[PDB]
């Protein structure tokens, strides 16, 4: 699993440092094992339509 | 000249060092500093 360029969020979500929205608080979180397993479930569901 | 090179690994290393320097892991427990200071917030995307 590859990740996007880190500079995308720095210039867009953290464009203003004196404000805090729903996106900015969770742009700094990290996933656990079960959450990665759920991501794998989502991708498996996508790759078999219907 | 104080030069900072575009190589990502170096910028990450200075970023980590500055984050340690401003907010160290040791007195973040004892002194219970507030994270709302303008400098510590500015540290988030200062050298990205």
């Amino acid at each position: 699993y590859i990740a996007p360029n880190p500079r995308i969020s720095s210039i867009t979500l953290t464009q203003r440092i004196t404000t805090t929205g729903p996106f900015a608080i969770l742009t700094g979180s990290t996933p656990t094992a079960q959450q990665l397993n759920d991501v794998r479930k989502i991708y498996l569901a996508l790759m078999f339509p219907g | 000249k104080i030069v900072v090179t575009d190589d990502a690994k170096k910028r990450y290393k200075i970023r980590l060092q500055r984050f340690r320097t401003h907010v160290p892991k040791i007195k973040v427990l004892k002194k219970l500093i507030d994270p709302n200071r303008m400098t510590v917030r500015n540290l988030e995307n200062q050298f990205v």
Partner: peptide
């Protein structure tokens, strides 16, 4: 590896 937004969450304990 840390972000300033997680600092508020871990700090508010």
């Amino acid at each position: 590896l840390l972000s300033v937004f997680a600092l508020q969450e871990i700090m508010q304990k």
